[PDB]
Symmetry: C4
Subunit: 385 residues, 4 copies
């Protein structure tokens, strides 16, 4: 519409200085007001009622801290390791298809750049359905030290996927995240309303993963596990890791929040030793360092964010991604000091209050008449004159 | 009022194309804006505070899924069996009196048509208080393969009901659903405010059902059971099934959500074998395939919807009913794939997280002064110029 | 102010026909829009944050029904007995001081009239601080069959109270309800803001009640008990009854909802036989027949309402009280039929679902940024043209 | 901005008479409307999402009373003892840096004055980062009977802190509250957005406190403990007391509400005798006498408020502080009468209902379409003409 130019007004010049960005929600607001209707619908949408999408975040709020005091926290280290490599931050940029919807000029290349340019380098998971080619995304990387993982959607035509694995493996990607939570559609009504899957094989099986292991040296991570039973199965077929995720609530609605599954899983993996034999990642609904800290405290090897970095890139490009990185990086550090720990390893569950972790409620319907007619108290107002 | 013509503006032409209908809530919106004040009041109203009416829905949100991954879900079948016959969908259109309030021209005939015309055929329960005669509703049916059940309100003058049973049985209806949850009024204040039961015998007893079994070969289903104790009693007198329902919250307010009772009942029916000897249906507050999947997972033989199909028919007639059917049908399929099952039989409770099923809360009153005076955080705004 | 005449507009002629009053909340709305600022502030106010005031109502919503079906409910009886006498309804009009604030001409006399005029006769508890004299309130009673109890606030000057007991006892009041929950102020900020207790002895003791028993033949009921421990003490000194109440939330804020205390108490009184030796009443936050039914199901001998009848009288006088009486009377009847019982005695707890009775929650603070920036789904709109 | 003069209009003359101030929330309202943007941002802000800040308050609402009746409460005493001295009230004014932001002329001196001028004298904790010098704040005190404690932020340059301790000790302060919950920043985004720690040593350790005990005769209280484990450690090194606090939610977000920790701690301190050997204070989110009563009932020696007295002083100065003092003092008295106790010692947990103390919930995301399309009940309106 002509209103695209109304956005050009917002977008151009009116965007606040990247330094004036205080948190990840700021990137989201700016994005909702500048991104094209198609882009925004695709980025911000979840499946159906978007309950799980939102529930992913809400669940973090069922966990409170039990911080230690009078501990020397002058020095604090947040670097850790993931899938064999050493990472500067305990978080990473998750796979998001069609980044050119928000970043028409550079797409995933600006993400690749933003992730490995600055002082801090974040692992970037590359989407099978990215707007750019795996070649130009891996080449865009400004650091030999930065990590890039590849998200795999196995094709119905396995020959195509067979080659893909070969190509990205050759291109140097450090690992393979095969997305198992998107066999079907996962209706995005926000997008649908706007218009007014052969690439994804609906027949993937544990046997196929068993065969994927033979066709690659790259660490394999089954992205999209939604139950402890499958985390165990992953360990059984011996894959490198698993990502407790529900696709950011873009797939099955009423899928539990990954953090809630994490809390259930780890203890079982610990009462079976599998703890060290399987790297459990977790994503969806993470917007603050404190969220990352709860996941890390429960056992997650690393925590992933999708939409925040997506919105950052769609507003400020490569630099926004770096700003987002710094932001989340500083939040993890400061809150760590306040928790009384100086390293990621020291991040244990004993620092968490999980007593209300299952206070996932649904009250009874509001009494509209009683509360409508009721007049609440008031603050003492100023003199008129 | 003259505003009826304001509705003719909405209704006529302004109604969005039936294909532009994304979900069941859409039928409801359109309906609230086009149906006559009397029709809307009668269709949308519940008893008193409409707590149960709404609670019926809310309860589904206390159940989350535990979906299986890496399972071949290319093929998925949702057909099942209900009261002896084979059904294409695990859901059905429940009885709703006076369909001509919303569909003046065809009333229940368009529901009959919409249910058996398309590729998918849904069982239609026919109301004793329907606007059309049982003869013209059964004749309206476009398919020999479609199922039509009859909802019975036993009259005080049992002679009238005796004949009814004979007539609808002769007319070919597949089963008798005798409604036991409406012995009294069940005040609909929305309707009452607008105006500013001899047909239903208040003396029905288990003995009467015992005698109804003798006067008919048709499967008998006691519609309106609200406690496990009565499901058991139903099994004791040997009726064909039962419908855990509270009349869509149009009768006793503060009656539990049927899905909540379902979860309590089935395990008892299983620890008594009665499970297979009694077909437990469940209705009220079902608006999405995921709702139908939770009930099917708990043990329901079939799930029923009343208002959604009512609103569909009142806006788009026969075709709206088919659209609503397709919609709910596609939602059940897709979410099924995402759960990791390929058939209705595979839908078991192990796919459900019922840990917060009883988190039916009522918080303490809001502190209006504390939260009134409190100013919340803000997103970083755009530059003015 | 001149706006008092703006109220004269509302009040006069504009008030809807008393028949057009559907429920007790209707009386409240009309009242808030017609009563004088002083009257409304005094009638509608509770102590401090008005949490308990509101909590009294909310608690009823933590109790759901388990109604029996296929039970002959043609005939239904709601008459019961209280403090020796036989009552038509299981509820009564509780004591409310200064009824002339809302009913300048007749005050408590219209309440006395409304309670004993019509077909149904409700016990009226008479307040020590009523606007009328105990003589003219008892004389205003249009029925020999109607009951009138007296609410007693023992004076610091016990001589005055000694005489009062003699006088009202002589005047024929059936019982003495001595209010024990108002030794101090109980700040009504709504009223206080408007202005911009020697009568109540703060030294009352169980010993004084023991002496009150000797100076009267009238059944004594300690009004305002807020803990099981005191219900037991009441039974120990041998008084006639007790009223689990917190003064309608006009006294101590954060006092439990009486229904919540009732549910705790009765079982203890039953495991000690005291059940029959002590009549437990319960008031506050009761606005519907279903509320009355839950209390009666838990064990309450009778349920009291204050503000509803107060608002009724302040809007429609004697007749409003009768309308309110009919209203609550019809609600108790209809819901009873729906529960599957035909008498008050048959109202037992087995008809209640008390599994979420303690789901008195206080969620964690809302995430203002996450939910602010979030855009929710939308209903498919109509065509513009 | 020029709008500072718009505030001068509010502030000057338009402020309601100090007597017209009904509660502590009133001081807050007036303050939000008259304090400079910088002052208000700094006074009203919490860290990040301000969840803990708000949660501190909300937690009090998970505790209800079990008040005793028929107890002589004519006389009621609220004086108690804290850190060796005798106090008139069981509460105190907590340390708040930069009081001159809100009270440019007198700052902390007016707090000092307001606390010791009137009939009632409240202990004033003096901040290390106060706008005034410790000398002029201690000299401002109008009473020899008033108590003044000193809040200590140990400097990285311990020599500076060593002197401070010597000076304030010499100046006569009664105790040392060394703040251990602020080693790092604790981002106040409200303030940050407005702009668009060498004084606090991040290396403080239990050993340092052990050495602070040797350099002073003053009772030492570790302010900012957030877990039972540290309360125990405090007792182990033998300090005088502890303050269960999270800095008013200005530090770690998702730190539990201190009252919630109090309830967990005391019983452990009692099952170890430590109860009398360690004075447990508690602050944050206290706005009413009933809040102070719950903390006192759980075992707190004294309860502290920060913002309320801060807002009082920033609007009405010395007199506002006295008004706030009177207000909170009257609220504690009245509610005490209503609870059935006459002294602070009689305040025990048996007067508390802690059964829903852990009902800290986070419901599942609202179903926006279902509740959007739903039309709720309505009150019967007045006649138009
Ligand atoms: C927002 C978004 C997420 C996508 C994403 C695209 C978008 C725009 N997609 S999708 O188009 O196929 O649905 C992918 C993708 O390419 N592949 C994948 O495995 N995950 C995909 N995800 C999910 C992603 O990997 C994270 O699970 C998700 O973003 C995490 O949720 P938050 O955004 O809430 O952190
Ligand atoms: C909405 C509605 C429901 C009616 C219905 C009429 C309407 C307009 N009515 S009623 O006139 O007596 O109240 C019937 C009816 O004819 N007979 C019956 O057994 N159920 C009747 N029901 C209830 C229906 O069978 C389902 O239980 C109900 O609609 C399910 O609730 P939802 O609409 O929330 O799915
Ligand atoms: C609304 C109201 C209630 C009063 C009442 C006056 C009003 C205006 N008052 S009071 O002025 O002293 O606080 C009395 C009274 O005279 N004596 C008494 O024992 N109860 C008194 N109550 C409390 C009454 O007996 C019931 O407990 C209360 O009204 C029940 O709460 P609901 O109004 O919420 O049903
Ligand atoms: C509101 C506020 C609180 C401050 C305070 C300043 C303000 C404006 N500050 S701060 O500049 O370092 O963040 C202090 C302070 O000087 N030192 C300290 O120990 N506590 C400080 N506190 C915390 C205070 O001691 C209480 O813990 C806090 O105010 C209690 O929370 P409520 O305000 O919710 O009662």
């Amino acid at each position: 519409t002509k209103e695209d130019i109304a956005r050009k007004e917002q977008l151009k010049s009116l965007l606040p200085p990247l330094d004036n960005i205080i948190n990840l929600y700021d990137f989201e607001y700016l994005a909702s007001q500048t991104l094209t209707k198609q882009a925004w619908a695709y980025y911000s949408s979840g499946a159906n009622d978007e309950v799980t999408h939102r529930e992913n975040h809400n669940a973090y709020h069922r966990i409170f801290f039990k911080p230690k005091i009078l501990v020397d926290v002058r020095k604090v280290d947040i670097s850790t390791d993931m899938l064999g490599s050493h990472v500067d931050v305990p978080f990473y940029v998750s796979a998001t298809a069609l980044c050119k919807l928000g970043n028409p000029l550079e797409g995933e290349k600006d993400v690749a750049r933003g992730c490995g340019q600055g002082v801090t380098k974040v692992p970037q998971m590359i989407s099978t359905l990215a707007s750019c080619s795996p070649e130009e995304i891996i080449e865009a990387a400004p650091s030999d030290k930065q990590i890039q993982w590849y998200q795999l959607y196995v094709n119905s035509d396995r020959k195509i996927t067979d080659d893909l694995v070969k190509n990205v493996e050759k291109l140097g990607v450090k690992a393979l995240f095969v997305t198992v939570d998107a066999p079907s559609l996962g209706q995005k009504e926000k997008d649908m309303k706007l218009k007014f899957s052969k690439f994804i094989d609906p027949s993937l099986t544990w046997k196929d993963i068993e065969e994927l292991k033979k066709k690659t040296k790259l660490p394999i991570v089954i992205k999209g596990v939604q139950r402890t039973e499958d985390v165990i199965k992953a360990a059984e077929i011996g894959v490198s890791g698993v990502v407790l995720s529900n696709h950011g609530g873009r797939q099955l609605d009423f899928s539990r929040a990954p953090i809630e599954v994490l809390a259930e899983t780890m203890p079982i993996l610990e009462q079976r030793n599998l703890k060290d034999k399987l790297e459990v990642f977790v994503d969806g609904g993470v917007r603050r360092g404190t969220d990352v800290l709860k996941a890390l405290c429960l056992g997650a090897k690393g925590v992933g964010l999708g939409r925040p970095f997506l919105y950052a890139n769609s507003c400020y490009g490569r630099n926004g991604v770096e700003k987002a990185i710094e932001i989340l990086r500083d939040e993890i550090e400061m809150s760590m000091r306040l928790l009384g720990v100086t390293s990621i390893a020291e991040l244990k569950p004993d620092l968490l209050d999980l007593s209300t972790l299952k206070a996932r409620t649904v009250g009874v319907p509001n009494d509209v008449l009683y509360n409508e007619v009721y007049e609440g108290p008031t603050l003492t107002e100023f003199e008129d004159a």
